[PDB]
């Protein structure tokens, strides 16, 4: 939900299948006795619907590699060479 | 037409609801701000864009 704050008005994770939970959690309200497996069964199942939509979001429409790519060059120092040089070029302005 | 009026028309005057009830789907009924936002602040917005 927070993301679809700010982001547009990219649909429920599981879509139309949110309203198929709703009916799971109705049939729960019938269920003459509180079940935590029932409950947690179709918890798990509306988290793996959700945890694969957002693994889409993130893999497609976040691009976890491209940030993993930057990270490795500037956080893991991927341009190596390119530090080298920074380094290179500071180190009279960084041994002060 | 006249006499139709006053006699016939007079005779044949036998010319004699939002279900607004949450107890059908509580459960699915939206919430008081939430069923508003769906199903009258979708359509204030839409006449607001127009």
């Given at each position: 939900?927070?993301?679809?704050?700010?982001?547009?008005?990219?649909?429920?994770?599981?879509?139309?299948?949110?309203?198929?939970?709703?009916?799971?959690?109705?049939?729960?309200?019938?269920?003459?006795?509180?079940?935590?497996?029932?409950?947690?069964?179709?918890?798990?199942?509306?988290?793996?619907?959700?945890?694969?939509?957002?693994?889409?979001?993130?893999?497609?429409?976040?691009?976890?590699?491209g940030q993993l790519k930057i990270i490795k060059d500037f956080y893991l120092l991927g341009r190596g060479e390119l530090f080298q040089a920074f380094i290179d070029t500071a180190q009279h302005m960084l041994k002060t | 037409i006249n006499f139709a009026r006053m006699y016939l028309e007079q005779s044949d005057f036998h010319e004699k609801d939002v279900c607004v009830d949450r107890s059908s789907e509580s459960v699915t009924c939206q919430t008081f701000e939430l069923t508003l936002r769906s199903c009258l602040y979708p359509h204030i917005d839409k006449q607001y864009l127009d």
């Open positions: 939900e927070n993301q679809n704050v700010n982001l547009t008005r990219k649909g429920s994770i599981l879509k139309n299948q949110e309203d198929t939970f709703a009916a799971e959690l109705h049939r729960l309200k019938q269920q003459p006795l509180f079940s935590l497996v029932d409950f947690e069964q179709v918890v798990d199942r509306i988290r793996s619907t959700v945890a694969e939509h957002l693994w889409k979001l993130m893999v497609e429409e976040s691009d976890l590699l | -």
